[PDB]
């Protein structure tokens, strides 16, 4: 019974504010892409149950460029960009509480509730992508070239194994920007190493920094237990610059509805988005659906890559902690 | 003392047969104590002038 | 770090630390515990890791046998707990007296 | 550190430090006591840590 641009429900003047606020409050960014090109805003227009889309490399290159002379004319030409199939996913929910949370925020949440939902989908994107990579990249024999371990009895993750894992891409360098981390690791690090609290630029305060790279703290990491005291950690290293995503759009972004027998009302969002590494291809096996797949099933097994070796671009290493 | 627990949001999925619903979660007591305090000043002219000029 | 897991469903929600003097004596003896002017405006608060610490000598203390000292040092950094004002009437009064010669203030 | 915290409640109330010459000799040998022009203007005074020394 108030201003409530949601309970007076102006769908315009609201939804774009929501999505934009989501993009530039969330991070990542960057790390990964921000405001991907019209290409993906086109193939994001509207498509259907995949598979997904293509999604070129970017560029063209070649080898050779033969010996042009009289004859043995050109040959128009060779490729090697064919698939990279991936998933299109669908999400949404209502709001948990009543109008109680909604305008409990306040009177005129033209901004407010929008900020709320925005931060929410931020965390969403975080979890889905992180668990996704973790579910796939590590477990297969196909990616092995991108993983290091050591990680038996010998190594602290300082200043050296970081060098090795950093240069496991021997051609490409200065492509490392983000760094994924488990809390305990950065504890050992801020103990020994120089990891440095730096407000970077204007504006806002602030993030941690190891070197030159902008680090990302996360809660969820696979943690094993081997006998004798050991604990092995993951903490992916990518900061590739980048991954990519495109939104698309559903029908009915936000719908204000109430109930009767009880005292409540409900807000809903249900947005679609498309995100994945390119990177490995998503096959179709051992999955129900559809679409999307799931969280778990979006992880457990069955992905397949084609490049192979370079321009993936991600690496992992399982390192012993500070013992 | 209400619990609004901020955003709360989660995932579910969009499927053929189902629909999202928000949650409730076992609303309990709320429990607090409103307290009453206040005191005097031992002051001489102490507080007023001794605290200074203005 | 263990206790930093101990927030039941939460990690990376920490904010501050409650403490007693002796522990932080061990602290700034050994470790890096940072002197931070970050928040505005003034200098400063002791900082363990990205976080304020609230120090006061008044705390609990235990005693074991062998005359050994267990310390408490609440670790919460919730963000947050809460308090709401409320108000009486007559916020501040001005009054004086006869026999003993003064004037007093009261607020409540 | 010990003498510094012999006040357990109060801290960051240490500013000046009184010193005998021989002591600061030992100190400028081992420790980092550093010569810093600090306030504006004028030059200058020794410093151990943020404290001014006398």
Structural class of chain A: alpha+beta
Backbone shape of chain A: globular
Major beta sheet, strand line-up of chain A? 1-11-8
Distance between the termini of chain A: 60 Å
Oligomer: part of a larger assembly
Q: How many distinct helices of chain A?
A: 7
Order of helices and strands of chain A: HHHEHHEHEHEEEEEEEEEE
Largest sheet of chain A: 3 strands, antiparallel
Largest interface: A-B, 24 and 16 residues
Question: Helical proportion of chain A?
Answer: 10-25%
Radius of gyration of chain A: 23 Å
Strand content of chain A: 5-15%
User: Based on DSSP secondary structure assignment, what is the total number of beta strands of chain A?
Assistant: 13
Main location (chain A): virion
Pfam family, one (chain A): Gp13-like
Subunit structure (chain A): Interacts with the scaffolding protein gp11. Interacts with the decoration protein gp12.
Family (chain A): Belongs to the lambda phage major capsid protein family.
Structure, briefly:
Chain A has 323 residues and is α+β, with helices and mostly antiparallel strands. In chain A, 22% of the residues lie in helices and 12% in strands. Chain A starts with a helix and ends with a strand.
Highlighted features:
22% helix, part of a larger assembly, two-stranded parallel ribbon, virus, alpha+beta, 3-stranded antiparallel β-sheet, Major capsid protein, globular, 4 chains, Major capsid protein (chain B), 323 residues
Structural write-up:
The structure is cut from a larger assembly and holds 4 copies of chain A. Chain A is of the alpha+beta class and 323 residues long. Chain A is 22% helix and 12% strand. The first copy, chain A, is built from 7 helices and 13 strands. Chain A has helices at residues 5-9, 15-25, 38-43, 99-104, 112-136, 161-167, 183-192; strands at 89-90, 147-148, 178-182, 196-198, 207-209, 214-218, 232-233, 244-246, 257-258, 265-266, 272-276, 316-317, 319-320. Chain A has a 3-stranded antiparallel β-sheet with strand order 1-11-8, covered by helices on one side. A two-stranded parallel sheet of chain A has the order 2-12. In chain A, strand 4 and strand 5 (207-209) form a beta hairpin. The longest helix of chain A has 25 residues, at 112-136. The first copy, chain A, starts with a helix and ends with a strand. The A-B interface holds A 90-97, 100-101, 104, 116-117, 119-121, 123-124, 266, 268, 270, 292, 294-295 and B 2, 4-14, 20-23.
């Amino acid at each position: 019974a108030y201003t409530k641009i949601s309970d007076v429900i102006v769908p315009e003047l609201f939804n774009p504010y929501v999505i934009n606020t989501t993009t530039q409050l969330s991070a990542f960014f960057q790390s990964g892409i921000a405001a991907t090109d019209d290409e993906l805003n086109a193939l994001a227009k509207k498509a259907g149950g995949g598979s997904t889309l293509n999604m070129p490399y970017w560029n063209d290159l070649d080898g050779d460029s033969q010996v042009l002379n009289d004859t043995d004319d050109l040959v128009p030409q060779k490729i090697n960009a064919g698939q990279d199939k991936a998933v299109l996913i669908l999400r949404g929910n209502a709001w948990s509480s009543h109008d109680l949370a909604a305008t409990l925020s306040g009177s005129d949440p033209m901004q407010a509730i929008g900020s709320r939902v925005a931060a929410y989908w931020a965390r969403e994107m975080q979890k889905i992508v992180f668990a996704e990579l973790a579910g796939v990249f590590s477990n297969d024999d196909m990616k092995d070239n991108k993983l290091d371990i050591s990680g038996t009895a010998d190594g602290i993750y300082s200043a050296e194994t970081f060098v090795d894992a950093s240069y496991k891409l021997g051609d490409h360098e200065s492509l490392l920007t983000a760094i994924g981390m488990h809390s305990a690791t950065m504890a050992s690090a801020v103990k020994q190493d120089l990891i440095e609290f730096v407000k970077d630029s204007q504006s806002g305060i602030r993030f941690p920094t190891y070197m030159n790279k902008r680090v990302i703290v996360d809660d969820s990491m696979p943690v094993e237990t081997l006998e004798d005291g050991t604990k092995v950690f993951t903490s992916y290293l990518f900061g590739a610059g980048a991954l990519g995503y495109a939104e698309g759009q559903p029908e009915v972004p936000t719908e204000t509805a109430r109930n009767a027998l009880g005292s409540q009302d409900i807000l809903i969002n249900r947005k679609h988005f498309v995100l994945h590494p390119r990177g490995v291809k998503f096959t179709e096996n051992a999955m129900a659906g559809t679409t999307p797949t799931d969280e778990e099933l979006a992880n457990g097994a069955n992905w397949q890559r084609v490049y192979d070796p370079k321009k993936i671009r991600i690496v992992q290493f399982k390192h012993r902690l500070q013992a």
